[PDB]
Design a protein around this nucleic acid. Structure first.
Ligand SMILES: [Mg+2]
Ligand SMILES: [Mg+2]
Ligand SMILES: [Mg+2]
Ligand SMILES: [Mg+2]
Ligand SMILES: [Mg+2]
Ligand SMILES: [Mg+2]
Ligand SMILES: [Mg+2]
Ligand SMILES: [Mg+2]
Ligand SMILES: [Mg+2]
Lengths: 140, 117, 56, 110, 103
RNA sequence: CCCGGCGAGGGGAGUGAAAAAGAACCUGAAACCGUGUACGUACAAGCAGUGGGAGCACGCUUAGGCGUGUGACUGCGUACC
RNA sequence: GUAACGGGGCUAAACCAUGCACCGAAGCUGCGGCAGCGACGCUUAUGCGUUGUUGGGUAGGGGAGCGUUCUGUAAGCCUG
């Protein structure tokens, strides 16, 4: 018959907990981006709706390799003309890891709709274990 | 002494016009489609089926490189272990073992890991 | 401003989307257990309650 | 014919009239108006006329005085479309098909 | 236990599975002669002893069943330039079934 | 015979082998225009397909991994003369 | 309008040296099939199986055919 496993509409979701307190920073994104798609996954034919479910912790412990601790363009221009452009170096932004840096995965995903389905939907935080505002249940 | 083109006239247009998909607008309704589009279909088709043999291979290795490495030795080293054998050489394609017979596959990564001199 | 090939079918059949008509929905008002028209009281006599236009 | 009436020509296009028709089906009959008399679109004034003519055929072709009935069918078909020309950019963008339909109303038993 | 081998393509993924393959040689008809495959075996691969090789001791092969070696398939397949058309052609095989006992 | 303006137009009944032959009348295609149903579709960029492809609607078979429709998501990728 | 790594991003994901391994084309090999020529096996007008090899190429040359209208074979055959 037509081979292609269907799209059970994001059938299963395996929960996980990275550490981010590591030393890989930017390298980690890939195995973080591959995961929310169909990396470790075999069946659940990607391309179509899908994903997984992992979560970041502190993450505040990153340095990148070279002097990237001091670079990284970063600007979040707005629909305001009048000459805006908000450039802030990485360390300048690392003061409060928000929608960025830890969120380096967004630029690594299919982008637009559906990819957008995974997006921040992995949670980030910046303190590891304490009062996990996130779902405490099953994780690895 | 009668061309009376009408006679095959119809059959020809109807033939190509027979593009079920309809595609879009003039691409079915108007004869204009045929050698413009029905022809493209033939062209785009001509290359994709044969160019596809690799597009899947690129996927096959894309997953082997993603499966075998997680348990030591990258895809680069993998086939190299595997490479050494008298009969041990079963190609990829079935290489998707990582999806159904993980135990086999990881039991196959040793066939290479421990194999690499 | 000339055009060149145009698909009568499909296309246009799409612009027609923004062309369907619409429905009202209004009351009868206390007296007329029906008409009342739209936000009016009633045309039968054109009265909201008495001597307005023509009534008792 | 199980009391019909239908139409032909007049001119009011298909989809135009096919819209108002959907409004009336199922119950209908006693709905000779209101679900029609309270909707103004040309298509409406046309379906009602034939609606009544149809419900009227309930005193001639068959019995069953007007009160029961159902109106289990209402469908409009494309009727021959008139052709005309239209002066425009020297004569290129001109086709104009007037289009027309009917209604074909029915009234059977539930 | 799983299965594995080549012979005209690595077609031996499925365990026993009874799937088509190639053809004997002199003739096809059915019956059998009892042809063990070879130790291409994934060690059979199937038990607490899934093994990288397949090589898990000498001699390990399954006997061929020889279920049904016939049939064909037909596929038009016709090319044509702008002045010709080899359009008219056909080449097929029968791929003998074979059920294959246990590993 | 019945609706209607003693309209137009139609619905029955009857003629007929047929009116799915009613005078617009043989056969009646295409463009073009509609009603109905299955699926897709209101955060997504481009010759609109092609390759891959899940889901859904039906159809499968004493499963056996399929047929028809539709096609989310995705690699490609600027009509013909 | 980044626009002098294709982008990402890189302190080595740069370079230099050394070596192994892997990816990678219609190249080669494997398997099946087509056609021309030389051979081989025979068979032997001949022909077929094995084999070596040759088969990118608009103008253009050569060679085979389809399907259509009409004629013979046809008051034969098919058909209310
Ligand atoms: Mg002609
Ligand atoms: Mg795949
Ligand atoms: Mg008028
Ligand atoms: Mg012009
Ligand atoms: Mg729907
Ligand atoms: Mg089919
Ligand atoms: Mg353009
Ligand atoms: Mg290759
Ligand atoms: Mg030919």
């Amino acid at each position: 018959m037509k081979t292609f496993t269907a799209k059970p509409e994001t059938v299963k979701r395996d929960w996980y907990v990275v550490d981010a307190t590591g030393k890989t920073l930017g390298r980690l994104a890939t195995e973080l981006a591959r995961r929310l798609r169909g990396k470790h996954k075999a069946e659940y034919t990607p391309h179509v709706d899908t994903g997984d479910y992992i979560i970041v912790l502190n993450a505040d412990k990153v340095a990148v390799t070279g002097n990237k601790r001091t670079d990284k363009v970063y600007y979040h221009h707005t629909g305001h003309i009048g000459g805006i452009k908000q450039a802030t170096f990485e360390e300048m932004i690392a003061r409060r890891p928000e929608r960025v840096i830890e969120i380096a995965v967004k630029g690594m995903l299919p982008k637009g709709p559906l990819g957008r389905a995974m997006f921040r939907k992995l949670k980030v935080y910046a303190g590891n274990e304490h009062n996990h505002a996130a779902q405490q249940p099953q994780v690895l | 002494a009668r061309v009376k083109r009408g006679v095959i006239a119809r059959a020809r247009h109807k033939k190509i016009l027979k593009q079920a998909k309809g595609y879009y607008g003039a691409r079915s309704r108007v004869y204009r489609v045929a050698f413009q589009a029905v022809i493209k279909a033939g062209q785009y088709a001509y290359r994709d089926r044969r160019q596809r043999k690799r597009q899947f291979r690129q996927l096959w290795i894309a997953r082997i490189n993603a499966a075998a490495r997680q348990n030591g030795i990258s895809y680069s080293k993998f086939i190299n272990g595997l490479k050494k054998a008298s009969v041990e050489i079963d190609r990829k394609i079935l290489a998707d073992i990582a999806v159904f017979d993980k135990v086999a596959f990881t039991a196959l990564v040793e066939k290479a890991k421990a194999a690499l001199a | 401003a000339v055009q060149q090939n145009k698909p009568t079918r499909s296309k246009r059949g799409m612009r027609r989307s923004h062309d369907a008509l619409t429905a009202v929905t209004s009351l009868s008002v206390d007296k007329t257990s029906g008409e009342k028209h739209l936000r009016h009281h009633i045309t039968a006599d054109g009265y909201y309650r008495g001597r307005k236009v023509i009534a008792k | 014919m199980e009391t019909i009436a239908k139409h032909r020509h007049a001119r009011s296009s298909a989809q135009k009239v096919r819209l108002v028709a959907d409004l009336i089906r199922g119950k209908k009959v006693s709905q000779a108006l209101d679900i029609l008399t309270y909707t103004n679109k040309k298509a409406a004034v046309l379906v009602k006329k034939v609606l009544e003519s149809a419900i009227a055929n309930a005193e001639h072709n068959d019995g069953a005085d007007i009160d029961d009935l159902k109106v289990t069918k209402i469908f409009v078909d494309e009727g021959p479309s008139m052709k005309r020309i239209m002066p425009r950019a020297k004569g290129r963008a001109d086709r104009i098909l007037k289009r027309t339909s009917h209604i074909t109303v029915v009234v059977s038993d539930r | 236990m799983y299965a594995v081998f080549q012979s005209g393509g690595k077609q031996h993924r499925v365990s026993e599975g009874q799937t088509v393959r190639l053809e004997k040689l002199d003739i096809a008809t059915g019956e059998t002669v009892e042809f063990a495959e070879v130790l291409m075996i994934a060690n059979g691969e199937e038990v607490k002893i899934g093994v990288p090789f397949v090589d898990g001791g000498v001699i390990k092969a399954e006997v061929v069943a020889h279920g049904r070696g016939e049939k064909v398939k037909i596929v038009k397949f016709r090319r044509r330039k702008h002045y010709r058309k080899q359009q008219g052609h056909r080449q097929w095989f029968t791929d003998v079934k074979i059920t294959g006992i246990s590993a």
